[PDB]
Amino acid sequence: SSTAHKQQNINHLLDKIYEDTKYPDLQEIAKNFNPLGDTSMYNDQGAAAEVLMKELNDHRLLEQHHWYSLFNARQREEALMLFAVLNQCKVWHCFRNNAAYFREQMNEGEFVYALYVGVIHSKLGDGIVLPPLYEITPHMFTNSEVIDKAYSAKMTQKAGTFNVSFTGTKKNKEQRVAYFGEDIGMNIHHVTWHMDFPFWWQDSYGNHLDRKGELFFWVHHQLTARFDFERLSNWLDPVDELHWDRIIREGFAPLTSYKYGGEFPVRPDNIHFEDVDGVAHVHDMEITENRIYEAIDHGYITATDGHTIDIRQPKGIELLGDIIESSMYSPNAQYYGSLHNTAHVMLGRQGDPHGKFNLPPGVMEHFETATRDPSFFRLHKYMDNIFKKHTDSFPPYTHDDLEFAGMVVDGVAIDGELTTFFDEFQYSLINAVDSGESIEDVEINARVHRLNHKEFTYKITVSNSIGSDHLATFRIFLCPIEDNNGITLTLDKERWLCIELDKFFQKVPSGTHTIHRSSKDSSVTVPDMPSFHSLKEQADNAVNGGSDLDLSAYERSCGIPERMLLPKSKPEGMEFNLFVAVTDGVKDTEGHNGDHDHGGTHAQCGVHGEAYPDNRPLGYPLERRIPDERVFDGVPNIKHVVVKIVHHPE
Amino acid sequence: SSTAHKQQNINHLLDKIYEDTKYPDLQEIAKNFNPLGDTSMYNDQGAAAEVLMKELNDHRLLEQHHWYSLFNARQREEALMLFAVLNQCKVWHCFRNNAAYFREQMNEGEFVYALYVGVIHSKLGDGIVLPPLYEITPHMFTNSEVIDKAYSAKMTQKAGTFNVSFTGTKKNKEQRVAYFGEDIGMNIHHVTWHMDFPFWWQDSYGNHLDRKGELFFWVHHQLTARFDFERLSNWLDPVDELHWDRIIREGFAPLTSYKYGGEFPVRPDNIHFEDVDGVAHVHDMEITENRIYEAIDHGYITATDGHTIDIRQPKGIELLGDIIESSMYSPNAQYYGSLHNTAHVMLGRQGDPHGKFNLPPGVMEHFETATRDPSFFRLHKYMDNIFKKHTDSFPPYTHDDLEFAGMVVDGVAIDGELTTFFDEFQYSLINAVDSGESIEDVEINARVHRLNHKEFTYKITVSNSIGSDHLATFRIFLCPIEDNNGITLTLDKERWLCIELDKFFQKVPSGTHTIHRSSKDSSVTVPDMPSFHSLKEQADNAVNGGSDLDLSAYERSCGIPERMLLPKSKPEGMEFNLFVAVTDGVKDTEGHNGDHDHGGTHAQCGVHGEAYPDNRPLGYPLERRIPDERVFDGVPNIKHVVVKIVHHPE
Ligand SMILES: *[C@@H]1O[C@H](CO)[C@@H](O)[C@H](O)[C@H]1NC(C)=O
Ligand SMILES: *[C@@H]1O[C@H](CO)[C@@H](O)[C@H](O)[C@H]1NC(C)=O
Ligand SMILES: [Cu+2]
Ligand SMILES: [Cu+2]
Ligand SMILES: [Cu+2]
Numbered sequence A, B: 001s002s003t004a005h006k007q008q009n010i011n012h013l014l015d016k017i018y019e020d021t022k023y024p025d026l027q028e029i030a031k032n033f034n035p036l037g038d039t040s041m042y043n044d045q046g047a048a049a050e051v052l053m054k055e056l057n058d059h060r061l062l063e064q065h066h067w068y069s070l071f072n073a074r075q076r077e078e079a080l081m082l083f084a085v086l087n088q089c090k091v092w093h094c095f096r097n098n099a100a101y102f103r104e105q106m107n108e109g110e111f112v113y114a115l116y117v118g119v120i121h122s123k124l125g126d127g128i129v130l131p132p133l134y135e136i137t138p139h140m141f142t143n144s145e146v147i148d149k150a151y152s153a154k155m156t157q158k159a160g161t162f163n164v165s166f167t168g169t170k171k172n173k174e175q176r177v178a179y180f181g182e183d184i185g186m187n188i189h190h191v192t193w194h195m196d197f198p199f200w201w202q203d204s205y206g207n208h209l210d211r212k213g214e215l216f217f218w219v220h221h222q223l224t225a226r227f228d229f230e231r232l233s234n235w236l237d238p239v240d241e242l243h244w245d246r247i248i249r250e251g252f253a254p255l256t257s258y259k260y261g262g263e264f265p266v267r268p269d270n271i272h273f274e275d276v277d278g279v280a281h282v283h284d285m286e287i288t289e290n291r292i293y294e295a296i297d298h299g300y301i302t303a304t305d306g307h308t309i310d311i312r313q314p315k316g317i318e319l320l321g322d323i324i325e326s327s328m329y330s331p332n333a334q335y336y337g338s339l340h341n342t343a344h345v346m347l348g349r350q351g352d353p354h355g356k357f358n359l360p361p362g363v364m365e366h367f368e369t370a371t372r373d374p375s376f377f378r379l380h381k382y383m384d385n386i387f388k389k390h391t392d393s394f395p396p397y398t399h400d401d402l403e404f405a406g407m408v409v410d411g412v413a414i415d416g417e418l419t420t421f422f423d424e425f426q427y428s429l430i431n432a433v434d435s436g437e438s439i440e441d442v443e444i445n446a447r448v449h450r451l452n453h454k455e456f457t458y459k460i461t462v463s464n465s466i467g468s469d470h471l472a473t474f475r476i477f478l479c480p481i482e483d484n485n486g487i488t489l490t491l492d493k494e495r496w497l498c499i500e501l502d503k504f505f506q507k508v509p510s511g512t513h514t515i516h517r518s519s520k521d522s523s524v525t526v527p528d529m530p531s532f533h534s535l536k537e538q539a540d541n542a543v544n545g546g547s548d549l550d551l552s553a554y555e556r557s558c559g560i561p562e563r564m565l566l567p568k569s570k571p572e573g574m575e576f577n578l579f580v581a582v583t584d585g586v587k588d589t590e591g592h593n594g595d596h597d598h599g600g601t602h603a604q605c606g607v608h609g610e611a612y613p614d615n616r617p618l619g620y621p622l623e624r625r626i627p628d629e630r631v632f633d634g635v636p637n638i639k640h641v642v643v644k645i646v647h648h649p650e
């Protein structure tokens, strides 16, 4: 019931997840605990526990040792039944005991999902650090070749560390950017964002997820823009957008497998979409798309009873994210459907669209794996352009809109060269292999090459010519100067390609002062996850003894990995525009304070258990059309400078 | 150097083929034997050993733990270099020592292939029974799910027997006939036929393979006709033929994996052929096809210098098989290419035709696996129709052609009901899993359901009204009466669909006599292979002690499995025409004797180390057009009767 004991409990529950628990205390609980024995431990007096126990007793739950997809409606419903129980627990012993009990009864994929979102969305989970999913379920992050070497290492009872190479061949130009969507941390960022902001969320679970639909737009806009920056760095053109009536040019072979369920399916190059039995017809996707664009071009969403909901206003983008994803916040799912989530399944199933071949779900049908597929970025550019029609519909900002009166950016510079490189990172495959009973384990690791960069610090010189210190928001973006054809981009053509590097609030005293901000402190990024082995060691050292470790150290798992803050760029160097906008922090943070702690990842992942701290539209001030660059040049609190990034190859 | 010791040596060499040998004697030989140390052990005084050793010493051979395809030109060349050495050994110690030495140096797939064809084509191999390849390399015969359970059984050190189900789902109508092409014995029949009659054979290896090109036509004609009989039994239409300019309707997901190389690739439904980089353009296949048909319709094959080779003669079909397969017997590979073998690769590679995805060869690129793919039978019907244009070009047989004067078939009947069913068969997966060092093995088996039938005996009453006993050939075929639409077939429309059930030579004494022939004695079929475990036990029992076991018991591994002699048919029963032709055995066997032993599989697999014993065209007397059924009805030595086959489901 302390953080050390809770962390250890979670560590134990997630250990060797494909086998019955090996911890005597958890075995005893799974044997003897009755989820219905004392309903006073629940806030709903047992309602959720009754629902799940009835499903269990009627033999209606998915078996153990079976693939699980969050996009599968019934499997999701089953996972959410366990989430609902955990979420109702008043105290930790309820949470732990129900987790231990249902770990041994329910499908492992459902259980892991429910336990993670249960920890994230319950106050009882505060202070717990979830192990990286690439060590809890390594199959979802590790190609089949390396798993086989792990299987071989286990079959032969010999330790080893095995190198993971990217999918494809050098003949496949898309392999040039495999280090983006295949990065294990980028995959954790993506799954964790959706765990923090789930489309199935209903506020009856206990609280509201502030601005979720707009953050849904923004986080995926940033994934798309970041991927395109890697393409530009590797002599590739931007991704095309998907369209339902045109071929998906770039196929994909994941070369990965489920632990149970077989190899992930492949998609050949240059295929037309086919209807997917049990999911949707291609034509249904076109109609859904049309209906969303009808709302955007009408300027209003149509409610279930036909009345209009105005979207010509700052929350319009959020309501659009609600209906596009779609989430349970959608005002009218009967009419607007679920374009984005259904599209994930439509794409994921194109290797077996009629269920003739007994193929498991595609990589697009899991947030753990979706960015590994090149078609992820074609789909999300397509979706991004829907949002962009709405954001482009507003009048361009004026001088008066943008000016922070009395605040001028005199200069922008960086301390330290902008240098990227690849280094090596290891994670454990032990959870992927079968052990027991009464046979000892051996160390089995994967080694991956990952993008990284050297530390740097921004130097932003501002002059506050008001006679008072003022809170300011510093908004930092990296923008392309030229496209892959060497063509110089206008600001209007740059703005939608810019990637967010940082956003922070800082008091600017009167006078001229230099603000320093380290790359490591970015509110866009989070560090590499601590290893499962490290979390066990720290939790065990605390429990066996008694030591209050400041676990309030790790960031969150949602956020672009720190190592991927910068695009790869080129060995010969590339020049980019570093764009800084300094805006009125008093107005931006009204209702959430400026001195308050906002965590390490508020730019795209918000603040755990709090409202979103920045009132401005996501992407401000680049999210509206800029047809006249003179407007931005005339605003003293906006400035961009040219910076150079060099890739250091091996 | 005796059969017991040779069998044990082979057993040891093939044991746990993915790991260094565990037998101390073979380890010593691999360490100390010099293939170039005493050239007097070779018939070529070491020429072949020098070629292979140079390749080995120059690091030019395929690494161990890598996929192998006989259709890969360079990998085949490497395997054949080892075959060439084994084939030159004068005595067994040369054969054994070179096998042991190169087992530890060469790729395991190349080694197994070379060792099998070396045993088959060397007189030193006489009396050896090769273990079934499904136990030597189980990955090539076992779906990935079951291998994973084997991997799990090994990782956990627990014995088990695991059920293999057919690929696909019940929504896939092609799964109705998966028991044909996925039968492990049918796969061994196919690989062994090609090992007995390899397209790479050159007579400089020591002997000629009699009528090989015509047997190539015939064995594949019979595979195609037998598959279509299973389709008819399961309410399916006949397979369509492939065409290079039309879609391949039926895709395929093997759900199988290589031990090294990854999962076998899938082919989606309804794809057009694409050019395959490094293999051929689709257009090249069309041109090759056209050139073959030009020879057929000209009535002659064009030699390299332009002179004509007449094919309007009994050996024409053989020369066509030579140029179509193509084999090294082809008179003009520069012009006629290799339609059939290239088509195997063209089909096999359609999941990755441009090498972008790092996918290993398809199931069509191994004789072990090719019949698992539905497209196998569409390709081979296409090829079969090329041969049929030639065979249809000859004048129909006349009464005088067909009559065996003084020999009448008075009656045809069967002792015993014709009943099919499915039963269970087990084979070991131990060679598929990793062991060692110094850790004990455990029993790991696959259980498959396989077609089978009850024993029956033909009763053929003949009257020999010549005043002398006469040798006769009994030719027995099963022919459809109606197609899948309930339409009654004419004899001309039946004949190409008939399947060979038996062919035997027997002296018919003067008078009226009943000939009895058991289904078990069919010259078309061979029994199930003895298990690797059984072969080890019998060889070990002989070596450790001294006992001359009549190993001259097992048939061969080439031949339709006995269990698959009859089509499945239907639970409600199906009627077929049983066609018996009794022909002049003196003329049919001229040059090969009648009383001589022809083995158990001469109909399609010939006689090991001897000429083909039947002079008639393969398929006689059904291989020419029969436009006038009156001709066959007027021949007393031909008779057909209606028989019923019933399937007994579980
Ligand atoms: C794996 O990578 C490490 C460093 O990244 C290297 O030392 C080692 O040689 C590699 N192993 C293999 C088998 O290539
Ligand atoms: C496997 O098949 C056997 C007989 O074919 C049967 O007894 C057994 O129940 C099957 N096992 C499973 C797990 O279905
Ligand atoms: Cu997402
Ligand atoms: Cu998405
Ligand atoms: Cu063949």
Ligand SMILES: [Cu+2]
Binding pocket: B220, B340, B344, B380
């Ligand atoms: Cu073939």
Ligand SMILES: [Mg+2]
Binding pocket: none
């Ligand atoms: Mg299922």
Ligand SMILES: [Mg+2]
Binding pocket: none
């Ligand atoms: Mg290779």
Ligand SMILES: [O]
Binding pocket: A220
């Ligand atoms: O997403």
Ligand SMILES: [O]
Binding pocket: A370
């Ligand atoms: O996504």
Ligand SMILES: [O]
Binding pocket: B220
């Ligand atoms: O073949």
Ligand SMILES: [O]
Binding pocket: B370
């Ligand atoms: O074949």
